[PDB]
């Protein structure tokens, strides 16, 4: 004997069976997941922080002239400097025309503080994604690994189990991130040598301690302000600086099916998309699903605030009443909203947060709280004013 | 009892079981999908549109050297020059040692028809996707809503239907978009500050009536002409007119799996792909699938038109000969070839017709029509030429 | 009578079941996938490849200079010189004492070889997913093909088989490729009117035999020599080649889950994510799953060569003991670590070699053989250093 199913994959939610086999006392399955982890394969393209503009000691020459040839440094640069400042040596001796030369150069190398405060951008496509299931059947409690590469066959109070591949594997990971401290963005950042001066990138190189420094940051050569030697020239500020100020909100919390994002290893979890289907030695005559909601009355939205196109800049809250404290889902029956978390936890006390999203100001959608409806009338502001850079 | 099972995710194509519970009157269950709206999320980055040069009035200098500063208008231009020669002077008002000086400067803003007239570029991932299913239990008609971030339960016909989470959730977006009119394009389009001249994104801003007008437009200030004082400069026509020109075919019609697009709430529509499990209150022995697909044959394949490399170049036409007027599912087994339509109205006139695309010139593969086979021979011509810009 | 599964869409790991149906002798039912097929749907944006510069013979002026107007010509320029009279060289040559003037003007098309040796670069999206699954019923073998973009019935000894929709269509490639040789390329590459010098796309154009041929490799004008008139200028090594020595590996090796990556259709083979449904004519009374598994134990794991933040960097080797040669799954309980394969086969050699992913220096993973565990333990070195471009 062999019964199919599928269960939903979402954590929270369960799925109960009363699997009533002819011979006596009658069990009662319950399984549900209780974790996803969909780990991306991040490949390192390069980091970028703030720089540090080098410039050496210059070189006071006379009417001898020199030119300066080109070495290979960061946006190197050096002009030869034809005819600047009256002070002299001796009595004014250089003579041969120009009367004075002046060879000044400077390069970029990253500021000394980029090992502990840089950005990382890889380039990342999903590796794999497993989900964690706590089967209670009857009077056992076992926890089995359920994949996408590959089903999973296991053996649970005597019962033979097999957790067929997941459906899918969706991932709220672009294939191009960039990762700060515990934030994760996902920006087309510009590729390797192409960084653009006062933007991000304005410096690149594929490790902090590597080798391979790129800059653009339009480091130009000024000529030289009669009185004290030095070296004058123009630049950009930062455009790290500049991204700390531009970059939005992260992924960490635009992150689309209730999906929950993570730094350290960097995946996304409990990502709510899809199905589990099992499969067990049992007919499906002793099979009988159970499905205990909770009951809700009295529906009510309430739009606080809300912002017009931007990922999920809108803010329900639903005031309603509940016969038994439990687990609804939410949905959204009118395609002109989007619901950012795809269940919340009904409690008596009457009420529930949640995050939406559209891009028509002024919607008027229909949110859902397990079998009840009500609606939602709002008016939302458009999007905030970017951060104009070096004008 | 609980019975499981899964019909396909294609709009069309039904599922049909006849339900023989030993009890009476046979039942015939007919469940099929009707529609499926997947949306995204946009996150507006910024719009652009058609641009306005803006020239100040004209610094008539003297005796005089006005200097100039630097405005924070969009990209601001000034330069001030030595000549207006051509004489204009009378003494009475500069009885200067010294010639001429002038003063000229210019700077962007939208053109006044951006309101009525621009494209939007928003950074889109998918948010939800739910699909409409008819189901005809019996004598009775009831329409669920089925997600997939969350399965549903309901009840029909006095038996319990609960229809898991669909498969997976295939988009036809991608991660960057842009919105014109009526059109959608899977455009790069170029980052926020970062635009460049004559090219889409000459200007940038993040709303129509936003403050944070962005532009490189390459405004060069020229040297006046002896005569009448005015202020010559070099430009680089509106690359947003340019980009009229240059972009494709939008998503519109190139969209994959018979996916097909919309554009005031924008999204995607009857996307076939996946799959939708449902479970009931019945043994899997009362149930008994039906399947009846209209036979057909004498198939024949033929080319109109067809171009290389790009989204569905081709246009290929089925004659045939039916014994009943149906719905077919079209395939392709020639990894050469792939249809964008994945299902097709059976009529008894004998006329259909597919999109089908290949990067193979001269390509050899054979079209399915439910279960008759052809073959398909055509010659295709390379991709039309790119417009180039200003050279 | 109508019974349900689902098997895994992993090419290798079969599905056994043992259909004792009530009559006489008992069926071994055994499907397995054997190959897969995702073909995306290639839209040839551009081409690029080594560029040939181009200056004709120039034009040697008297004092009656001309002025050069503006030609249709890839990165065309030209430029009037005065008093750059090379002057002198046997008779007279503008007396005029004062200047006479040189035209000189170069402009780009694409190198001699760009037929036989040039990149692609492709908007692809997946465009159709089909796999092909060998049944063998008792003593009968048959294939039987299955899709995305809906089911298949198919009747194979004289039972009713409908293969439903394969739960997703997971793809390796993004929406932006460049097809080389047979190499494929996940690369942001440079829109089409966007090439830089010195970087891929320095020249661009939508086929070989193109005629909009667009360039930008910063051609500059120098000033004649005196001496033997000639036309001098500077320029950036073709981007092209500088792309050659850049561009990493390719995706055919660093493909996941593992996809196996083809050249000539360009697709992906045997991708090992979701799951393939069927249902028959046999009450789940008659079925029952068999599940034989290699049995192996002392397990080992052994890292070679390791490398940090890139697409599986490193090597993973398992030594083991088997009961049976067999085909075993392969997993990572850690989400510090992923792995590339998702099966491997069982010898009784006892080698095992696999290769893993991880972006954190000093990991320390548990992989798993079928139902065997292991740790491994190492220490990986940073990401080669990129490979600095014209400074
Ligand atoms: C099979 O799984 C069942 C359910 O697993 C759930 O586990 C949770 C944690 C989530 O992962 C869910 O998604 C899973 O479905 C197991 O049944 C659970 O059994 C435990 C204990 O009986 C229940 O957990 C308790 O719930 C009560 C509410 O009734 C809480 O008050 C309680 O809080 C504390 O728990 C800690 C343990 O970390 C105690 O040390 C602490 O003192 C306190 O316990 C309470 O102590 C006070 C005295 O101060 C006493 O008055 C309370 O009676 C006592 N509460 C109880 C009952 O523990 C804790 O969270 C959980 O609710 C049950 N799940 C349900 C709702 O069915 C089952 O045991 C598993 N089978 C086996 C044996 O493996
Ligand atoms: C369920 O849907 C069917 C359509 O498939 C409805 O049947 C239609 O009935 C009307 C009048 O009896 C006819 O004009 C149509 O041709 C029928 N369509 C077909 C093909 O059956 C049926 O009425 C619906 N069930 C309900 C709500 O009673
Ligand atoms: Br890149
Ligand atoms: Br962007
Ligand atoms: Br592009
Ligand atoms: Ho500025
Ligand atoms: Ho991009
Ligand atoms: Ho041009
Ligand atoms: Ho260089």
Redesign the interface.
């Known amino acids: 004997?062999?019964?199919?199913?599928?269960?939903?994959?979402?954590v929270g939610?369960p799925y109960k069976?009363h699997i009533e086999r002819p011979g006596y006392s009658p069990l009662t399955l319950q399984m549900q997941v209780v974790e996803t982890?969909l780990?991306p394969?991040?490949?390192?393209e390069?980091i970028t922080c703030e720089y540090k503009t080098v410039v050496p000691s210059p070189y006071v020459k006379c009417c001898g002239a020199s030119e300066c040839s080109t070495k290979?440094?960061?946006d190197?640069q050096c002009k030869v400097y034809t005819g600047v400042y009256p002070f002299m040596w001796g009595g004014a001796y250089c003579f041969c025309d120009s009367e004075n030369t002046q060879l000044s150069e400077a390069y970029v190398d990253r500021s000394d503080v980029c090992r502990h405060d840089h950005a990382s951008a890889?380039?990342a496509?999903?590796?794999?994604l497993?989900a964690k299931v706590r089967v209670m059947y009857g009077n056992v409690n076992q926890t089995v690994?359920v994949?996408?590469?590959?089903?999973?066959?296991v053996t649970i109070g005597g019962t033979?189990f097999?957790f067929?591949?997941?459906?899918?594997?969706?991932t709220?990971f672009?294939?191009?991130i960039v990762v700060y401290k515990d934030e994760v963005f996902?920006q087309?950042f510009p590729?390797?040598?192409?960084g653009?001066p006062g933007?991000f990138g304005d410096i690149q190189?594929?490790?902090v301690?590597?080798?391979?420094?790129?800059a653009n940051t339009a480091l130009k050569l000024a000529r030289p302000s009669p009185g004290m030697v030095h070296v004058p020239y123009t630049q950009t500020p930062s455009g790290f600086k500049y991204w700390l100020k531009?970059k939005g909100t992260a992924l960490n919390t635009?992150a689309?099916?209730?999906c929950q994002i993570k730094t350290n290893?960097?995946?996304a979890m409990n990502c709510?998309?899809?199905?589990i289907?099992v499969?067990m030695?049992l007919?499906?005559?002793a099979?009988?699903?159970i499905?205990e909601?909770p009951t809700i009355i009295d529906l009510t939205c309430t739009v606080a605030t809300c912002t017009?196109?931007?990922?999920?800049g809108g803010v329900l809250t639903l005031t309603y009443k509940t016969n038994k404290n439990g687990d609804c889902?939410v949905?959204?029956?009118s395609?002109?909203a989007?619901?950012q978390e795809?269940?919340a936890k009904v409690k008596t006390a009457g009420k529930v947060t949640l995050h939406f999203?559209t891009?028509?100001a002024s919607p008027s959608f229909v949110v859902s709280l397990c079998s009840a409806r009500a609606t939602c009338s709002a008016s939302c502001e458009?999007?905030?004013?970017?951060?104009?850079?070096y004008?």
């Open positions: 004997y062999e019964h199919s199913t599928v269960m939903p994959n979402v939610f069976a982890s780990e394969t991040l490949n390192l390069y290979e440094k960061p190197y890889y380039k496509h999903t590796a794999s497993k690994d994949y996408v590469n590959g089903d999973h066959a033979q097999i067929g591949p997941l459906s899918s594997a969706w709220p672009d294939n191009k996902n087309d590729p390797y040598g192409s653009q933007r190189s594929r490790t301690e590597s080798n391979d420094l790129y531009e635009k689309p099916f209730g290893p960097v995946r709510a998309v899809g199905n289907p499969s030695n007919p499906d005559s099979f009988t699903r499905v909601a017009h196109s931007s990922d999920f889902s949905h959204s029956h395609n002109v989007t619901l795809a269940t999203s891009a028509s458009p999007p905030k004013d970017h951060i104009v850079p004008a």
